[PDB]
Amino acid sequence: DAASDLKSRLDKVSSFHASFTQKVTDGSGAAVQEGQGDLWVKRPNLFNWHMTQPDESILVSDGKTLWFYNPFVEQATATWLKDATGNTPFMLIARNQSSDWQQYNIKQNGDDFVLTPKASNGNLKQFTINVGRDGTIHQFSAVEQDDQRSSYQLKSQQNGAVDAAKFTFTPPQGVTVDDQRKHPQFEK
Ligand SMILES: CCCCCCCCCCCCCCCC(=O)N[C@H](CSC[C@H](COC(=O)CCCCCCCCCCCCCCC)OC(=O)CCCCCCCCCCCCCCC)C(N)=O
């Protein structure tokens, strides 16, 4: 079925580097943003996403901490990865328990798959992925409630082209750090 076919394809890949092009389209049909950069990924939950143009930004997951680094304003935020990837198909990679796949209705047209959550209250209501029978990922998208779609076209996929340093982040000299992992709050 679509689910088994999609899992069988993604199962072929463990790590890669790829370059990406991003297109954000609003439901109006206007492409409201375009960008490019590099992605390194390593199972189960490690990634380094670096948007180089137009507005530089770095997301690094060591599998527990997600760092967001804006080099333009020299600000880095440390968050828990689990707080950013919840209610997405991230768990299909990071955990890959059979019942995780059962959260989504998955439909196939060739190398194109569409994942629709069955019982989510989240903002993301659709995912798409184009992945060849060899596990090469060509495209991915996510759709928000207002129909804003964030789409990624991957090129130059190279499996195994990652080192462990890509998945570690130490704030550079002079970078302001907001560590949201660590003043207690009074409530009515
Ligand atoms: C499909 C089958 C299973 C694959 C599942 C992958 C799920 C990816 C979700 C990533 C979580 C988002 C973290 C950003 C925080 C955020 O800002 N949240 C919300 C965002 S709301 C709007 C939108 C929504 O965000 C996105 O969907 C980003 C998509 C970009 C990734 C495209 C490459 C595809 C790679 C798939 C690889 C499979 C692995 C194969 C084997 C290794 O935001 C954006 O597009 C901008 C943010 C881009 C930053 C993405 C970098 C994460 C790449 C993670 C890929 C690693 C996958 C597993 C690791 C082994 C918010 N702002 O509230």
mmCIF file of C-alpha atoms and ligand atoms in Angstrom:
data_model
loop_
_atom_site.group_PDB
_atom_site.id
_atom_site.type_symbol
_atom_site.label_atom_id
_atom_site.label_comp_id
_atom_site.label_asym_id
_atom_site.label_seq_id
_atom_site.Cartn_x
_atom_site.Cartn_y
_atom_site.Cartn_z
ATOM 1 C CA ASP A 1 0.000 0.000 0.000
ATOM 2 C CA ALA A 2 1.121 3.699 -0.110
ATOM 3 C CA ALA A 3 2.331 3.600 3.557
ATOM 4 C CA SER A 4 4.447 0.406 3.161
ATOM 5 C CA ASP A 5 5.863 1.713 -0.155
ATOM 6 C CA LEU A 6 6.794 5.110 1.380
ATOM 7 C CA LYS A 7 8.379 3.455 4.510
ATOM 8 C CA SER A 8 10.208 0.920 2.246
ATOM 9 C CA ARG A 9 11.746 3.881 0.277
ATOM 10 C CA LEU A 10 12.737 6.049 3.292
ATOM 11 C CA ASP A 11 14.181 2.850 4.943
ATOM 12 C CA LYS A 12 16.883 2.863 2.192
ATOM 13 C CA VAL A 13 18.494 6.147 3.488
ATOM 14 C CA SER A 14 20.244 6.775 6.836
ATOM 15 C CA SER A 15 22.120 10.067 6.254
ATOM 16 C CA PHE A 16 22.571 12.615 3.419
ATOM 17 C CA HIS A 17 23.558 16.120 2.378
ATOM 18 C CA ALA A 18 21.278 17.910 -0.141
ATOM 19 C CA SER A 19 20.917 21.464 -1.416
ATOM 20 C CA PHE A 20 17.366 22.873 -1.296
ATOM 21 C CA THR A 21 15.217 25.510 -2.849
ATOM 22 C CA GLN A 22 12.275 26.744 -0.735
ATOM 23 C CA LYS A 23 8.994 28.145 -2.106
ATOM 24 C CA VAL A 24 6.293 29.423 0.319
ATOM 25 C CA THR A 25 2.884 29.860 -1.425
ATOM 26 C CA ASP A 26 -0.157 31.410 0.339
ATOM 27 C CA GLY A 27 -3.659 29.968 -0.406
ATOM 28 C CA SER A 28 -4.089 33.085 -2.653
ATOM 29 C CA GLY A 29 -1.488 31.309 -4.938
ATOM 30 C CA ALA A 30 1.239 33.997 -4.490
ATOM 31 C CA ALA A 31 4.779 32.597 -4.006
ATOM 32 C CA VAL A 32 5.505 34.913 -0.981
ATOM 33 C CA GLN A 33 9.042 33.646 -0.263
ATOM 34 C CA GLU A 34 11.827 31.754 -2.097
ATOM 35 C CA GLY A 35 15.124 30.681 -0.493
ATOM 36 C CA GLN A 36 17.992 28.252 -0.827
ATOM 37 C CA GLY A 37 20.471 26.451 1.356
ATOM 38 C CA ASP A 38 21.883 23.125 2.513
ATOM 39 C CA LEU A 39 20.407 20.245 4.568
ATOM 40 C CA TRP A 40 22.385 17.491 6.386
ATOM 41 C CA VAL A 41 20.249 14.705 8.002
ATOM 42 C CA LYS A 42 21.181 11.587 10.017
ATOM 43 C CA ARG A 43 18.780 9.036 11.546
ATOM 44 C CA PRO A 44 17.158 8.962 13.854
ATOM 45 C CA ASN A 45 16.653 12.696 14.596
ATOM 46 C CA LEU A 46 19.808 14.745 13.708
ATOM 47 C CA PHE A 47 19.731 17.578 11.177
ATOM 48 C CA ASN A 48 21.484 20.816 10.126
ATOM 49 C CA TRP A 49 19.284 23.127 7.961
ATOM 50 C CA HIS A 50 21.169 26.210 6.705
ATOM 51 C CA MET A 51 19.186 28.788 4.629
ATOM 52 C CA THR A 52 21.978 30.837 2.935
ATOM 53 C CA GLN A 53 19.792 33.120 0.682
ATOM 54 C CA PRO A 54 17.903 35.346 1.053
ATOM 55 C CA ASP A 55 17.812 35.654 4.909
ATOM 56 C CA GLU A 56 20.387 33.395 6.603
ATOM 57 C CA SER A 57 19.206 31.024 9.341
ATOM 58 C CA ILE A 58 20.561 27.813 10.868
ATOM 59 C CA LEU A 59 18.560 25.054 12.615
ATOM 60 C CA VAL A 60 20.707 22.308 14.297
ATOM 61 C CA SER A 61 19.273 19.217 16.049
ATOM 62 C CA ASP A 62 21.614 17.012 18.106
ATOM 63 C CA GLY A 63 18.502 14.807 18.644
ATOM 64 C CA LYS A 64 17.576 16.527 21.953
ATOM 65 C CA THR A 65 18.240 20.297 21.603
ATOM 66 C CA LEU A 66 17.031 22.322 18.565
ATOM 67 C CA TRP A 67 19.187 25.455 18.116
ATOM 68 C CA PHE A 68 17.842 28.355 15.957
ATOM 69 C CA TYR A 69 20.667 30.748 14.974
ATOM 70 C CA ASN A 70 20.005 34.075 13.182
ATOM 71 C CA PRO A 71 23.539 35.229 12.248
ATOM 72 C CA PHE A 72 22.207 38.612 10.969
ATOM 73 C CA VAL A 73 21.154 39.776 14.487
ATOM 74 C CA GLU A 74 23.630 37.292 16.184
ATOM 75 C CA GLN A 75 20.874 35.563 18.246
ATOM 76 C CA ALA A 76 20.637 31.828 19.022
ATOM 77 C CA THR A 77 17.695 30.159 20.797
ATOM 78 C CA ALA A 78 18.066 26.700 22.460
ATOM 79 C CA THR A 79 14.782 24.737 22.538
ATOM 80 C CA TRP A 80 13.735 21.077 23.037
ATOM 81 C CA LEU A 81 13.499 19.318 19.640
ATOM 82 C CA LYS A 82 10.329 17.502 20.877
ATOM 83 C CA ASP A 83 8.581 20.920 21.161
ATOM 84 C CA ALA A 84 9.179 21.687 17.400
ATOM 85 C CA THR A 85 8.595 18.243 15.735
ATOM 86 C CA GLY A 86 5.427 17.177 17.641
ATOM 87 C CA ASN A 87 2.328 16.634 15.459
ATOM 88 C CA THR A 88 4.473 16.198 12.282
ATOM 89 C CA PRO A 89 5.642 13.023 10.496
ATOM 90 C CA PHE A 90 9.084 13.549 12.192
ATOM 91 C CA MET A 91 8.229 10.509 14.412
ATOM 92 C CA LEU A 92 7.978 8.274 11.245
ATOM 93 C CA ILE A 93 11.816 8.733 11.032
ATOM 94 C CA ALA A 94 12.759 9.438 14.672
ATOM 95 C CA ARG A 95 10.790 6.542 16.219
ATOM 96 C CA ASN A 96 9.259 4.620 13.259
ATOM 97 C CA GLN A 97 6.891 2.513 15.549
ATOM 98 C CA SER A 98 4.267 0.819 13.305
ATOM 99 C CA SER A 99 1.324 2.650 15.007
ATOM 100 C CA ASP A 100 3.054 6.045 14.210
ATOM 101 C CA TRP A 101 2.408 5.335 10.468
ATOM 102 C CA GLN A 102 -1.317 4.724 11.381
ATOM 103 C CA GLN A 103 -1.657 8.411 12.443
ATOM 104 C CA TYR A 104 -1.675 9.385 8.730
ATOM 105 C CA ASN A 105 -3.822 8.590 5.722
ATOM 106 C CA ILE A 106 -1.074 8.127 3.054
ATOM 107 C CA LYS A 107 -1.914 8.191 -0.696
ATOM 108 C CA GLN A 108 0.549 7.571 -3.591
ATOM 109 C CA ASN A 109 0.757 8.773 -7.208
ATOM 110 C CA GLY A 110 4.030 7.326 -8.526
ATOM 111 C CA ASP A 111 6.872 8.820 -6.388
ATOM 112 C CA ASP A 112 4.445 11.481 -4.914
ATOM 113 C CA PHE A 113 2.944 10.802 -1.510
ATOM 114 C CA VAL A 114 0.422 12.815 0.492
ATOM 115 C CA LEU A 115 0.112 12.344 4.297
ATOM 116 C CA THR A 116 -3.062 13.633 5.974
ATOM 117 C CA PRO A 117 -3.259 13.325 9.771
ATOM 118 C CA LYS A 118 -6.349 11.385 10.897
ATOM 119 C CA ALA A 119 -7.010 12.991 14.286
ATOM 120 C CA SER A 120 -4.723 16.049 14.715
ATOM 121 C CA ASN A 121 -5.728 19.385 16.354
ATOM 122 C CA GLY A 122 -2.453 20.908 14.968
ATOM 123 C CA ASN A 123 -1.801 23.804 12.540
ATOM 124 C CA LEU A 124 -0.300 21.407 9.877
ATOM 125 C CA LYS A 125 -3.046 19.581 7.979
ATOM 126 C CA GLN A 126 -1.100 18.013 5.064
ATOM 127 C CA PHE A 127 2.422 16.823 4.215
ATOM 128 C CA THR A 128 3.735 15.787 0.791
ATOM 129 C CA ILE A 129 6.961 14.037 -0.195
ATOM 130 C CA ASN A 130 8.396 12.932 -3.554
ATOM 131 C CA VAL A 131 10.894 10.060 -2.962
ATOM 132 C CA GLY A 132 12.207 7.706 -5.657
ATOM 133 C CA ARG A 133 12.234 3.917 -5.289
ATOM 134 C CA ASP A 134 15.975 4.323 -4.345
ATOM 135 C CA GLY A 135 15.132 6.607 -1.354
ATOM 136 C CA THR A 136 16.296 9.828 -3.109
ATOM 137 C CA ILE A 137 14.084 12.635 -1.708
ATOM 138 C CA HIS A 138 13.182 15.138 -4.466
ATOM 139 C CA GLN A 139 10.548 17.315 -2.701
ATOM 140 C CA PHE A 140 8.748 17.825 0.638
ATOM 141 C CA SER A 141 5.965 20.220 1.680
ATOM 142 C CA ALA A 142 3.830 21.051 4.716
ATOM 143 C CA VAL A 143 0.440 22.883 4.601
ATOM 144 C CA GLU A 144 -0.851 25.066 7.472
ATOM 145 C CA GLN A 145 -4.595 25.556 8.294
ATOM 146 C CA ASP A 146 -4.702 28.808 6.212
ATOM 147 C CA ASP A 147 -3.350 26.780 3.206
ATOM 148 C CA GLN A 148 0.146 28.393 3.371
ATOM 149 C CA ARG A 149 2.435 25.711 1.845
ATOM 150 C CA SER A 150 6.191 25.501 2.595
ATOM 151 C CA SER A 151 7.773 23.441 -0.236
ATOM 152 C CA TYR A 152 11.373 22.206 -0.550
ATOM 153 C CA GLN A 153 13.001 20.945 -3.782
ATOM 154 C CA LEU A 154 16.117 18.845 -2.894
ATOM 155 C CA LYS A 155 19.025 18.354 -5.340
ATOM 156 C CA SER A 156 22.499 16.756 -5.229
ATOM 157 C CA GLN A 157 21.403 14.196 -2.578
ATOM 158 C CA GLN A 158 24.632 12.424 -1.367
ATOM 159 C CA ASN A 159 23.965 9.544 1.132
ATOM 160 C CA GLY A 160 26.612 9.251 3.946
ATOM 161 C CA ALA A 161 27.999 12.813 3.231
ATOM 162 C CA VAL A 162 27.624 13.895 6.964
ATOM 163 C CA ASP A 163 30.059 14.158 9.950
ATOM 164 C CA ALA A 164 28.960 14.340 13.628
ATOM 165 C CA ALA A 165 30.143 18.007 13.892
ATOM 166 C CA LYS A 166 27.247 19.040 11.569
ATOM 167 C CA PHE A 167 24.866 18.042 14.439
ATOM 168 C CA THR A 168 26.529 19.939 17.322
ATOM 169 C CA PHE A 169 26.091 23.686 17.946
ATOM 170 C CA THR A 170 28.169 25.983 20.158
ATOM 171 C CA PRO A 171 27.155 29.669 20.015
ATOM 172 C CA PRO A 172 29.917 31.746 18.311
ATOM 173 C CA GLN A 173 31.773 34.543 20.246
ATOM 174 C CA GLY A 174 29.380 37.528 20.634
ATOM 175 C CA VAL A 175 26.129 35.642 19.916
ATOM 176 C CA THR A 176 23.276 36.299 22.357
ATOM 177 C CA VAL A 177 21.754 33.025 23.631
ATOM 178 C CA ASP A 178 18.095 32.658 24.707
ATOM 179 C CA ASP A 179 18.158 29.160 26.375
ATOM 180 C CA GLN A 180 14.450 28.221 26.669
ATOM 181 C CA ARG A 181 15.391 24.740 28.091
ATOM 182 C CA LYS A 182 16.085 26.306 31.590
ATOM 183 C CA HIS A 183 12.417 33.306 36.908
ATOM 184 C CA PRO A 184 9.367 31.262 38.129
ATOM 185 C CA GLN A 185 5.869 32.586 37.139
ATOM 186 C CA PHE A 186 2.940 33.727 39.387
ATOM 187 C CA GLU A 187 -0.566 32.839 38.042
ATOM 188 C CA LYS A 188 -4.143 34.028 38.993
HETATM 189 C C1 LIG B 1 7.349 12.761 4.998
HETATM 190 C C2 LIG B 1 7.766 11.411 5.560
HETATM 191 C C3 LIG B 1 8.569 11.577 6.843
HETATM 192 C C4 LIG B 1 9.472 12.810 6.890
HETATM 193 C C5 LIG B 1 9.123 13.723 8.052
HETATM 194 C C6 LIG B 1 10.000 14.947 8.249
HETATM 195 C C7 LIG B 1 9.221 15.966 9.044
HETATM 196 C C8 LIG B 1 9.878 17.318 9.036
HETATM 197 C C9 LIG B 1 9.298 18.253 10.068
HETATM 198 C C10 LIG B 1 10.482 19.031 10.625
HETATM 199 C C11 LIG B 1 10.060 19.788 11.885
HETATM 200 C C12 LIG B 1 10.105 21.305 11.773
HETATM 201 C C13 LIG B 1 11.149 21.906 12.703
HETATM 202 C C14 LIG B 1 11.163 23.414 12.522
HETATM 203 C C15 LIG B 1 10.443 24.133 13.639
HETATM 204 C C16 LIG B 1 9.312 24.947 13.080
HETATM 205 O O1 LIG B 1 9.615 25.920 12.476
HETATM 206 N N1 LIG B 1 7.929 24.494 13.297
HETATM 207 C C17 LIG B 1 6.733 25.176 12.808
HETATM 208 C C18 LIG B 1 6.853 25.400 11.293
HETATM 209 S S1 LIG B 1 5.291 25.754 10.420
HETATM 210 C C19 LIG B 1 5.643 25.960 8.622
HETATM 211 C C20 LIG B 1 6.793 25.111 7.977
HETATM 212 C C21 LIG B 1 6.756 23.611 8.345
HETATM 213 O O2 LIG B 1 8.022 23.025 8.537
HETATM 214 C C22 LIG B 1 8.445 21.992 7.691
HETATM 215 O O3 LIG B 1 7.684 21.170 7.321
HETATM 216 C C23 LIG B 1 9.899 21.898 7.265
HETATM 217 C C24 LIG B 1 10.191 20.962 6.091
HETATM 218 C C25 LIG B 1 11.674 21.059 5.685
HETATM 219 C C26 LIG B 1 12.368 19.723 5.413
HETATM 220 C C27 LIG B 1 12.417 19.389 3.929
HETATM 221 C C28 LIG B 1 13.356 18.209 3.663
HETATM 222 C C29 LIG B 1 12.660 16.856 3.723
HETATM 223 C C30 LIG B 1 13.453 15.828 4.492
HETATM 224 C C31 LIG B 1 12.653 14.572 4.836
HETATM 225 C C32 LIG B 1 13.772 13.603 5.237
HETATM 226 C C33 LIG B 1 13.296 12.246 5.712
HETATM 227 C C34 LIG B 1 14.479 11.516 6.370
HETATM 228 C C35 LIG B 1 15.044 10.372 5.564
HETATM 229 C C36 LIG B 1 16.150 9.554 6.254
HETATM 230 C C37 LIG B 1 17.235 10.376 6.919
HETATM 231 O O4 LIG B 1 8.014 25.758 8.281
HETATM 232 C C38 LIG B 1 9.086 25.866 7.360
HETATM 233 O O5 LIG B 1 9.042 25.308 6.300
HETATM 234 C C39 LIG B 1 10.349 26.634 7.803
HETATM 235 C C40 LIG B 1 11.146 25.732 8.765
HETATM 236 C C41 LIG B 1 12.149 24.858 8.021
HETATM 237 C C42 LIG B 1 13.073 24.168 8.994
HETATM 238 C C43 LIG B 1 13.067 22.683 8.650
HETATM 239 C C44 LIG B 1 14.330 21.908 9.070
HETATM 240 C C45 LIG B 1 13.947 20.503 9.551
HETATM 241 C C46 LIG B 1 14.435 19.401 8.643
HETATM 242 C C47 LIG B 1 14.117 18.115 9.376
HETATM 243 C C48 LIG B 1 14.373 16.916 8.514
HETATM 244 C C49 LIG B 1 14.991 15.759 9.257
HETATM 245 C C50 LIG B 1 14.070 14.574 9.229
HETATM 246 C C51 LIG B 1 14.450 13.457 10.188
HETATM 247 C C52 LIG B 1 15.852 13.546 10.757
HETATM 248 C C53 LIG B 1 16.561 12.215 10.568
HETATM 249 C C54 LIG B 1 6.580 26.521 13.517
HETATM 250 N N2 LIG B 1 7.384 27.665 13.108
HETATM 251 O O6 LIG B 1 5.793 26.628 14.401
#
